[PDB]
Design a protein around this ligand. Structure first.
Ligand SMILES: [Mn+2]
Ligand SMILES: [Mn+2]
Ligand SMILES: [Mn+2]
Ligand SMILES: [Mn+2]
Lengths: 340, 339, 340, 342
């Protein structure tokens, strides 16, 4: 039941063509620290992971980045803005898995090219001053570009998975674990516990050979509230999450996803969620360290990549709505930071 | 990352412990037999039974030699295959199984663990006992999948795309558990996904990464393992079956007598089997198999002090095992007659 | 007694960045056949392997190529001109081993870069319509660029070596085996015999992993007369070589090296040797299928790479002398071909 | 991959090293014998290195039995001779033929290299375990990773002494190395090879895990020349004295080894004794520049095309065990006197 096995270039090949620049290296290292500070309550800025549900077009992604960069800089004292640069998508059943798996968007599975494109995009983003985030779904691909990533997500469908927790335990960036598809938070709390410890498992080296990897633990993990059978973004759900986190002795600072099961897949509700968060930040909101927003140049979605700057996976808010949502959150958090 | 250590590739182990003709024949055969059960071509009942986890190959061999007599005795009613689980998903942390740490002392001697697991599996198949395991890691299966007749994807990974990818390329039938809180849809979805062709990054038998292109696994099914509440009874089975037919996949399913269906009390496994027995007597058309956590000695222990006694989930003992198997054999003999 | 082990990119990396073009592929394939034809007496054109003793500067090599190309074309009915593009040099004791082993020429041993440069140069040469030749000295480097090579040499110092005969047995290009440093011809005749057979040995794949290679034999091997304690380029030496070749049942068509031990340390002598060959081609010269000439933009040699287009290994004839030598051989062989 | 028929699965050295890890006793013998030989190479000890045994190993059981006999003599003569067994797994052919036990261990054209490499490691481990150190010709670039840890002394053959990749290889081996003069008698190429091998090199090699890598060697300071004849023999005093002057001149060790076989015996195994007799006499008169000898020896004398008779070479002809006992006593006696004069 295996059709074929094909030639794969090892990470060192891509690392040779596209070595990390000093300026990229500095941004990554820096943003990781900054985020770690948010995770552990040492800085009260709000982390904002924002951008497309998935990258299908580097040029659009670069243009998006350039716009977002101005706002990253403008709001830098209230918000820590990092771009969503997602290359791997977990499907409910089957479908396009992302740019790495099939970069020509036609069923050709040109993975060598996909991995090259993903590294290239990430390098250009970091070079221009925009840090990047992604969902780490595969066990092997991260060796190809993890060095360019400032923050990582483990998805709702894999938070419970031991191999994903293992993976997170060895990543050098902070990591967010989503609650489960039906709303189970415990699995994410458990995942932080697990990922913070040392693990031994089989992995693949930068030279494309299998090996035993021994990780040191990732101390910068946190939970992401992304809704379930019902939304879990409000104050009450946040307060209950926080108590459970303190109970298991892990960080009670969390991220709230404005999209997915919290917006019920209606991109026009992301603003409502952000409005609720804004209010929580104004009243108290002490347990919130970040938010997640799926955002693009052009709002909505499409099945085929016909329109530029428009998602082919989950529907996104457009650029206008994005400017508004960011100003809303910046304003709200400026007040939270002023209180102490 | 603290360290990176010297991993032998599968071909090393395959060279020392090549699959024998007799093992190869048993595997191939038991895979077909199970496929038949999955697709309703045979009415025997698949019974995946044995320890929660293997921590001692000698005990596992003795268990096997007892189970073998019953496999034979009940071969017309039951298809008995031994649980030979080498990888254990922990809720947080703990011992991850014999592969990850075979000396049990925190030494993580994986090369040795993989060797021991292959060796045990080869001896089991050689003696006429087929084997089953949970495929948890993406890379370890290359080392011994050829000796496995049936595979499980655990409750914790059924929703995971990489595990569905993996299942898509396994040559054995595969059971997907419903989720830890009882969600069945994820398992139905997983069958759908695993039955299709996938492209992903994997590791060859020579220990090098490569692009793998799978052909799909047509012999997947669902496993009812309880959630917030048990899901083994006739009603839950009927509801499961309707959902499965609705998604156009096999409406033949497996019921786990342990874990969340026994509420983590090994003494309830018998109750669940009693309910299944009754369903098999009345009708039970949608049941193709059961799962039972069983050992020489009942219960559990935190240290491997007593021989033949689980150090992970508590198991029923051998006495209780003979009883459960006779109970299911008797019940299914009637279902097969009535057809 | 091993200091270190360093990261080596596998051939597939270089093959991905610099894949062989259709035009290059066609030229190589074609030139291999054309040379095979000479080796086995199906065409009477004269193979001329000509160019620098070693490549130390790709720009000079490209300019040399552009000049040589015009002559390749001009003389294409009489001569088959292929450029010497030698990247690996055997030293009598120690010294610079070539551009691959140390491309910056400062003792840095940047082999990943050297291999890249060598591939790049070879691709550009073939793309411009100039086929290439080299000495295959290492067992592993050929995987990186053999696909761009139209004719290969096994050196005087390795003709007797079984691993080099093995290597030749698997090369897809014709191969010339030099007589030994003291003039022993038998070792080259033996080598043809060996290289023409099937071998099993340990090699390295294009992915940089060791494997058992099973070769089919190279049926296009021939001998190269390169002098010894005494020169062996004249008619008598050629006739005696030819008799020995027929006796061992292998091709009695051979190449004569105008340089090295045949010119005895004065590069000017190369012209004398070519004069003698010319005369042989006028009288009869039936057993001669090619010649080898060490040639550059500028004549002579130098210890440091100070002057452009001037060898830093064996001394070469200059471009003027080169035009002369080629016209001389073209004129002579035109007559040999006319006799028929 | 045009005139390549196939590519087959090769187990990496680490596989074999896992099944057959070097024992403490083996490790100690190897380390110790390497030092002892180094001492001979550099004139710190006057014992005579004797590399002796079959031209090629085609049968491990015969090799073990040979070893057990040779061991008694290794012990008996330990104050005069340093005896190390010839355990040659790779044979360079003049054209084609059987290339040795590694390349084709079933001796039938099956090229079961994985098995050959296993057998070679196993034999070497058993030899060192029983107290018999081992020597081989390093011919391939890749096979040595599989068993070099079990080798106390290495040869680079007449046909490869001039080869740069073999000099590179020697530069990274942990054992002493002998370079043979060329097939027609050229000694310079061996002197050059010592020079080269003693320096640091960078080249492409294969790791113990079966991946290519850049290897940086530190140089092998324990290389020496081996006189093995050419168009004419080169074992006598005069040839030795002329070799020695050339060695001093290039600033490398003037202590050398003389091969009693191959071109020195004109491929007549009955002449090996004559050569040893000449050496013996040189050791009695002076023989200051001689640090060792090489002898092609087996249980049974002669050779055969097919492996019919036990203990009988299928490559160069060897002297038999009787002749071996005599040759060793002859050299022991002779060298006991040389060591007395000091
Ligand atoms: Mn999304
Ligand atoms: Mn269990
Ligand atoms: Mn030259
Ligand atoms: Mn021999």
């Amino acid at each position: 039941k295996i059709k074929e096995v094909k030639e794969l270039l090892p990470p060192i090949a891509h690392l040779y063509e596209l070595p990390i620049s000093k300026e990229a290296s500095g941004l990554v290292h820096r943003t990781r620290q900054e985020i770690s500070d948010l995770v552990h309550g040492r800085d009260k800025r709000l982390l904002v992971i924002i951008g497309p549900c998935s990258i299908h077009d580097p040029k659009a992604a670069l243009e998006y980045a350039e716009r977002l960069l101005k706002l990253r800089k403008q709001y830098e004292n209230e918000l820590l803005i990092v771009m969503r640069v997602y290359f791997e998508k977990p499907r409910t059943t089957v479908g396009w898995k992302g740019l790495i798996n099939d970069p020509h968007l036609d069923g050709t599975f040109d993975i060598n090219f996909g991995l090259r494109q993903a590294r290239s995009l990430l390098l250009s983003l970091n070079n221009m001053g925009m840090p990047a985030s992604t969902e780490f779904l595969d066990m092997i691909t991260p060796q190809y570009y993890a060095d360019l990533i400032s923050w990582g997500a483990i998805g709702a469908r894999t938070t419970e998975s031991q191999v994903h927790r293992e993976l997170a335990s060895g990543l050098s960036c902070p990591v967010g674990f989503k609650n489960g598809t039906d709303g189970n938070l415990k699995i994410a709390i458990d995942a932080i516990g697990a990922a913070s410890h040392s693990h031994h498992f089989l992995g693949v080296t930068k030279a494309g050979h299998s090996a035993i990897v021994h990780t040191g633990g990732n101390p910068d993990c946190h939970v992401i509230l992304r809704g379930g059978k019902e939304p879990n973004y409000d104050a009450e759900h946040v307060s209950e999450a926080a108590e459970q986190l303190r109970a298991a002795g892990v960080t009670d600072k969390l991220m709230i996803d404005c999209s997915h099961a919290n917006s019920r897949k209606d991109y026009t509700r992301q603003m409502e969620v952000a409005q609720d968060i804004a209010a929580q930040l104004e009243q108290d909101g002490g347990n919130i360290m970040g938010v997640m927003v799926e955002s693009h140049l052009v709002e909505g979605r499409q099945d085929k990549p016909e329109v530029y700057g428009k998602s082919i996976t989950d529907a996104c808010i457009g650029w206008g709505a994005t400017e508004e949502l960011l100003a809303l959150l910046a304003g709200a958090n400026k007040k939270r930071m002023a209180r102490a």
